[PDB]
Design an enzyme around this catalytic site. Structure first.
Site, PDB file in Angstrom:
ATOM      1  N   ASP A 174      -6.878  58.087  17.422  1.00 44.81           N
ATOM      2  CA  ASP A 174      -5.750  58.461  16.596  1.00 44.81           C
ATOM      3  C   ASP A 174      -5.980  57.991  15.173  1.00 44.81           C
ATOM      4  OD1 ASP A 174      -3.170  59.144  15.743  1.00 44.81           O
ATOM      5  OD2 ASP A 174      -2.477  58.675  17.760  1.00 44.81           O
ATOM      6  N   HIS A 225      -3.501  58.839  12.734  1.00 40.63           N
ATOM      7  CA  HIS A 225      -2.177  58.818  12.110  1.00 40.63           C
ATOM      8  C   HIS A 225      -1.791  57.380  11.851  1.00 40.63           C
ATOM      9  CE1 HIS A 225      -2.194  62.792  14.109  1.00 40.63           C
ATOM     10  NE2 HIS A 225      -1.247  63.212  13.277  1.00 40.63           N
ATOM     11  N   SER A 252      -3.442  59.539  22.841  1.00 38.01           N
ATOM     12  CA  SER A 252      -3.140  58.179  22.477  1.00 38.01           C
ATOM     13  C   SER A 252      -2.329  57.536  23.581  1.00 38.01           C
ATOM     14  CB  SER A 252      -2.414  58.121  21.142  1.00 38.01           C
ATOM     15  OG  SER A 252      -3.305  58.500  20.115  1.00 38.01           O
TER      16      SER A 252
HETATM   17  C1  COB Z   1       7.140  58.177   8.903  1.00 36.48           C
HETATM   18  C2  COB Z   1       6.371  58.857  10.026  1.00 36.48           C
HETATM   19  C3  COB Z   1       6.446  60.250   9.880  1.00 36.48           C
HETATM   20  N1  COB Z   1       5.540  61.014  10.720  1.00 36.48           N
HETATM   21  C4  COB Z   1       4.332  61.394  10.287  1.00 36.48           C
HETATM   22  O1  COB Z   1       3.708  60.797   9.438  1.00 36.48           O
HETATM   23  C5  COB Z   1       3.405  62.291  10.916  1.00 36.48           C
HETATM   24  C6  COB Z   1       3.566  63.742  10.505  1.00 36.48           C
HETATM   25  C7  COB Z   1       2.805  65.018  11.070  1.00 36.48           C
HETATM   26  C8  COB Z   1       3.202  66.241  10.172  1.00 36.48           C
HETATM   27  C9  COB Z   1       3.007  65.152  12.542  1.00 36.48           C
HETATM   28  C10 COB Z   1       4.286  65.740  12.887  1.00 36.48           C
HETATM   29  C11 COB Z   1       5.270  64.752  13.436  1.00 36.48           C
HETATM   30  N2  COB Z   1       5.629  65.140  14.560  1.00 36.48           N
HETATM   31  O2  COB Z   1       5.691  63.710  12.791  1.00 36.48           O
HETATM   32  C12 COB Z   1       1.788  65.842  13.132  1.00 36.48           C
HETATM   33  N3  COB Z   1       0.860  65.342  12.184  1.00 36.48           N
HETATM   34 CO1  COB Z   1      -0.887  65.299  12.951  1.00 36.48          CO
HETATM   35  C13 COB Z   1      -0.736  67.258  12.274  1.00 36.48           C
HETATM   36  N4  COB Z   1      -1.686  64.990  11.170  1.00 36.48           N
HETATM   37  C14 COB Z   1      -0.959  64.456  10.097  1.00 36.48           C
HETATM   38  C15 COB Z   1      -1.970  63.699   9.121  1.00 36.48           C
HETATM   39  C16 COB Z   1      -2.074  62.238   9.460  1.00 36.48           C
HETATM   40  C17 COB Z   1      -2.186  61.503   8.092  1.00 36.48           C
HETATM   41  C18 COB Z   1      -1.874  60.158   8.271  1.00 36.48           C
HETATM   42  N5  COB Z   1      -2.654  59.301   7.889  1.00 36.48           N
HETATM   43  O3  COB Z   1      -0.780  60.014   8.853  1.00 36.48           O
HETATM   44  C19 COB Z   1      -3.236  64.412   9.357  1.00 36.48           C
HETATM   45  C20 COB Z   1      -3.285  65.675   8.521  1.00 36.48           C
HETATM   46  C21 COB Z   1      -4.588  63.657   9.107  1.00 36.48           C
HETATM   47  C22 COB Z   1      -3.004  64.876  10.830  1.00 36.48           C
HETATM   48  C23 COB Z   1      -4.029  65.018  11.687  1.00 36.48           C
HETATM   49  C24 COB Z   1      -3.830  65.473  12.927  1.00 36.48           C
HETATM   50  N6  COB Z   1      -2.569  65.865  13.471  1.00 36.48           N
HETATM   51  C25 COB Z   1      -2.759  66.562  14.645  1.00 36.48           C
HETATM   52  C26 COB Z   1      -1.772  66.925  15.558  1.00 36.48           C
HETATM   53  C27 COB Z   1      -2.009  68.236  16.395  1.00 36.48           C
HETATM   54  C28 COB Z   1      -0.429  66.564  15.384  1.00 36.48           C
HETATM   55  N7  COB Z   1       0.082  66.008  14.346  1.00 36.48           N
HETATM   56  C29 COB Z   1       1.330  65.606  14.468  1.00 36.48           C
HETATM   57  C30 COB Z   1       1.295  63.973  15.070  1.00 36.48           C
HETATM   58  C31 COB Z   1       1.857  66.431  15.734  1.00 36.48           C
HETATM   59  C32 COB Z   1       3.012  65.686  16.507  1.00 36.48           C
HETATM   60  C33 COB Z   1       2.346  67.754  15.224  1.00 36.48           C
HETATM   61  C34 COB Z   1       2.629  68.877  16.142  1.00 36.48           C
HETATM   62  N8  COB Z   1       3.842  69.116  16.468  1.00 36.48           N
HETATM   63  O4  COB Z   1       1.523  69.473  16.427  1.00 36.48           O
HETATM   64  C35 COB Z   1       0.643  66.687  16.510  1.00 36.48           C
HETATM   65  C36 COB Z   1       0.330  65.877  17.711  1.00 36.48           C
HETATM   66  C37 COB Z   1       0.642  66.761  18.813  1.00 36.48           C
HETATM   67  C38 COB Z   1       0.260  66.024  20.121  1.00 36.48           C
HETATM   68  N9  COB Z   1       1.150  65.750  20.973  1.00 36.48           N
HETATM   69  O5  COB Z   1      -0.955  65.708  20.333  1.00 36.48           O
HETATM   70  C39 COB Z   1      -4.333  66.784  14.618  1.00 36.48           C
HETATM   71  C40 COB Z   1      -4.790  66.881  16.091  1.00 36.48           C
HETATM   72  C41 COB Z   1      -4.603  68.085  13.853  1.00 36.48           C
HETATM   73  C42 COB Z   1      -5.838  68.474  13.602  1.00 36.48           C
HETATM   74  N10 COB Z   1      -6.755  67.850  13.063  1.00 36.48           N
HETATM   75  O6  COB Z   1      -5.904  69.650  13.937  1.00 36.48           O
HETATM   76  C43 COB Z   1      -4.959  65.663  13.828  1.00 36.48           C
HETATM   77  C44 COB Z   1      -5.287  64.404  14.502  1.00 36.48           C
HETATM   78  C45 COB Z   1      -6.174  63.491  13.832  1.00 36.48           C
HETATM   79  C46 COB Z   1      -6.555  62.339  14.951  1.00 36.48           C
HETATM   80  N11 COB Z   1      -7.703  62.052  15.276  1.00 36.48           N
HETATM   81  O7  COB Z   1      -5.689  61.659  15.540  1.00 36.48           O
HETATM   82  C47 COB Z   1       0.451  64.462   9.941  1.00 36.48           C
HETATM   83  C48 COB Z   1       0.888  64.027   8.507  1.00 36.48           C
HETATM   84  C49 COB Z   1       1.288  64.926  10.971  1.00 36.48           C
HETATM   85  O8  COB Z   1       7.053  58.796  11.362  1.00 36.48           O
HETATM   86  P1  COB Z   1       6.487  58.118  12.738  1.00 36.48           P
HETATM   87  O9  COB Z   1       7.178  58.623  13.862  1.00 36.48           O
HETATM   88  O10 COB Z   1       5.064  58.347  12.775  1.00 36.48           O
HETATM   89  O11 COB Z   1       6.818  56.557  12.619  1.00 36.48           O
HETATM   90  C50 COB Z   1       8.309  56.025  12.947  1.00 36.48           C
HETATM   91  C51 COB Z   1       8.624  54.803  12.084  1.00 36.48           C
HETATM   92  C52 COB Z   1       9.935  54.810  11.563  1.00 36.48           C
HETATM   93  O12 COB Z   1       9.763  54.087  10.511  1.00 36.48           O
HETATM   94  O13 COB Z   1       8.163  53.620  12.630  1.00 36.48           O
HETATM   95  C53 COB Z   1       7.815  53.964  14.077  1.00 36.48           C
HETATM   96  N12 COB Z   1       6.500  53.593  14.693  1.00 36.48           N
HETATM   97  C54 COB Z   1       5.356  54.262  14.586  1.00 36.48           C
HETATM   98  N13 COB Z   1       4.345  53.475  14.872  1.00 36.48           N
HETATM   99  C55 COB Z   1       4.898  52.328  15.422  1.00 36.48           C
HETATM  100  C56 COB Z   1       6.266  52.412  15.346  1.00 36.48           C
HETATM  101  C57 COB Z   1       7.124  51.369  15.902  1.00 36.48           C
HETATM  102  C58 COB Z   1       6.580  50.194  16.511  1.00 36.48           C
HETATM  103  C59 COB Z   1       7.641  49.138  17.078  1.00 36.48           C
HETATM  104  C60 COB Z   1       5.147  50.066  16.571  1.00 36.48           C
HETATM  105  C61 COB Z   1       4.642  48.932  17.193  1.00 36.48           C
HETATM  106  C62 COB Z   1       4.243  51.100  16.048  1.00 36.48           C
HETATM  107  C63 COB Z   1       8.325  55.420  14.317  1.00 36.48           C
HETATM  108  O14 COB Z   1       7.450  56.266  15.123  1.00 36.48           O
END
Ligand code: COB
Ligand code: COB
Lengths: 246, 246
Positions: free
Chosen positions: A107, A109, A160
């Site tokens: 992961d 994120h 994850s």
């Molecule tokens: C503030 C934060 C906002 N949330 C976000 O930041 C995430 C947003 C979003 C749009 C996802 C949609 C979503 N559902 O949110 C999507 N991504 Co991203 C497209 N992604 C990205 C972004 C990450 C950048 C970074 N560094 O964060 C990237 C572009 C790189 C990205 C990459 C991927 N992404 C991917 C996927 C598909 C998804 N992505 C998601 C997570 C999601 C849910 C979207 C979807 N719907 O498809 C997918 C996961 C689906 C699944 N079930 O597997 C993927 C695979 C895409 C790709 N390459 O094709 C790839 C994965 C990379 C990997 N190896 O893991 C993003 C931005 C997103 O909220 P949060 O919930 O994470 O934190 C919140 C917070 C409140 O303050 O604290 C909490 N918390 C979190 N951690 C902890 C705690 C609390 C405690 C007590 C702890 C101990 C730990 C609580 O959870």
């Protein structure tokens, strides 16, 4: 000004996120900052909603990776601005505890692993953030070496969830005793009760968000509260398995 | 220090609910109303929080039924007071849809089935609330006769969950096609995706709360939004099963 530039600050935040516009994020966040009682509120309010929509549009393929990536940079920039407005809020105080938090293996994120880190920080705790994709054994080695009082695992992608179940077992193997905190957008109490907890004799508490983490961490660390909370929780987790048809 | 009658209105609300005091509920709710953007906020803010506490005290045996029953009376009194302020809040012009909502068999909890009803109503929807403890057969019979565009089930105790799964099955038997909305304090998206959906070819969407129901009912009913929302949802529930080791 373009019509969008005239909507409600909160509606302007969401738009910016979706569109990946970095030109008005600061001045928009600040305006939103002045309206909220607490900085954390803008993050867990407007900003999160905006990221939700981004999430969805992406999921329905109406948005692509290169775009969610621009949306992330805006989110990132928005959080960055708030960060000191947060740290100015922590007068005196020393340390109440210490936590090694880390985005699980596979992961990348971290936007949230961070907000929870910044929050617990201005709450007087020491957070040794191991970063993204950190291996179970490197989680424990540090937890030991630094003598953490808890361990937080963040997780956002389906797989994850398994690495979490895994470090739960691994922790138990080394016979750990510290409370395990689970979280991340794709983390649910259901799964934490159904598939994570059982693998570990110490407390495993699923916390929904950053602001609510302070509440758990205090309990988990209070000589008075500890044993009760941990039971209330264990018993709550006992019920959900019951319901999911154990 | 002194009596509760000096605390923050929100803090006075939560107290009145716990102790079952009906002497200041309206006067207090009103003060709370003037601070919230929308009445629904107080119902879903303070009021809910109070009822949560109440539930807990009952659960820990620190509170008894005849007491939770009085707390109910107060919560009920507070909502009532609020209703006209809601109705005087919006009327658009005509009906957007029609829903038959009802609290599942053997369940008698309804303070929420109603809030979601009063919310949906001022948003221009017709709601034929079949009440509490309604059998599957009567729900469907009414769904057909009244030609509802949706069906809403409220459930707050563990057994209800099973009746929900049951009416999903029963709807499928009569080869229904309208979307089925699930909700209630003991209802989770996980159980909704793992144990409820699979049993029905039409949409099964779990809505967290009343206010957010508007946003779904609209999609479910939009020629544009429909097929996408319903697909995103289904796919989301697909993932949750996968994580749940299914
Ligand atoms: C503030 C934060 C906002 N949330 C976000 O930041 C995430 C947003 C979003 C749009 C996802 C949609 C979503 N559902 O949110 C999507 N991504 Co991203 C497209 N992604 C990205 C972004 C990450 C950048 C970074 N560094 O964060 C990237 C572009 C790189 C990205 C990459 C991927 N992404 C991917 C996927 C598909 C998804 N992505 C998601 C997570 C999601 C849910 C979207 C979807 N719907 O498809 C997918 C996961 C689906 C699944 N079930 O597997 C993927 C695979 C895409 C790709 N390459 O094709 C790839 C994965 C990379 C990997 N190896 O893991 C993003 C931005 C997103 O909220 P949060 O919930 O994470 O934190 C919140 C917070 C409140 O303050 O604290 C909490 N918390 C979190 N951690 C902890 C705690 C609390 C405690 C007590 C702890 C101990 C730990 C609580 O959870
Ligand atoms: C506004 C409403 C507030 N919530 C409340 O009003 C419930 C409060 C409370 C304290 C429960 C604690 C709790 N956790 O809440 C507890 N009850 Co009551 C002690 N109780 C009562 C009260 C209900 C009276 C009434 N008419 O409402 C009674 C005293 C009669 C009562 C009765 C029972 N209760 C019982 C029990 C133990 C519990 N009770 C609970 C529900 C609970 C959760 C508490 C606990 N913890 O123990 C127990 C059930 C746990 C379980 N897993 O089974 C019981 C068994 C006690 C007894 N007699 O021994 C009994 C059940 C009898 C039966 N045959 O059903 C109460 C007041 C409660 O929120 P809500 O979540 O229902 O609505 C909310 C709202 C947001 O706007 O809309 C949503 N929504 C809800 N329905 C729908 C939707 C949205 C959509 C899209 C839909 C289609 C449908 C969303 O859910």
């Amino acid at each position: 000004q373009a019509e969008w530039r005239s909507w409600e600050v909160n509606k302007r935040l969401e738009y910016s996120l979706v569109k990946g516009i970095t030109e008005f994020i600061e001045q928009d966040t600040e305006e939103a900052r002045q309206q909220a009682t607490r900085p954390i509120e803008v993050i867990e309010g407007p900003l999160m909603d905006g990221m939700n929509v981004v999430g969805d549009l992406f999921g329905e393929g109406k948005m692509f990776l290169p775009q969610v990536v621009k949306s992330a940079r805006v989110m990132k920039q928005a959080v960055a601005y708030l960060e000191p407005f947060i740290e100015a809020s922590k007068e005196q105080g020393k340390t109440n505890g210490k936590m090694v938090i880390a985005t699980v293996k596979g992961d990348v994120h971290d936007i949230g692993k961070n907000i929870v880190g910044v929050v617990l920080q201005c709450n007087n705790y020491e957070i040794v953030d191991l970063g993204v994709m950190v291996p179970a054994e490197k989680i424990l080695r540090t937890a030991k070496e630094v003598n953490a009082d808890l361990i937080g695992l963040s997780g956002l992608i389906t797989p994850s969830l398994d690495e979490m179940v895994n470090v739960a077992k691994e922790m138990e193997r080394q016979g750990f005793t510290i409370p395990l905190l689970i979280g991340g957008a794709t983390t649910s109490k259901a799964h934490t009760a159904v598939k994570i907890e059982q693998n570990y004799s110490g407390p495993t508490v699923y916390v929904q968000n950053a602001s609510r983490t302070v509440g758990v961490v205090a309990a988990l660390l209070s000589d008075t509260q500890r044993d009760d909370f941990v039971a209330r929780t264990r018993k709550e987790y006992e019920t959900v398995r019951i319901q999911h048809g154990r």
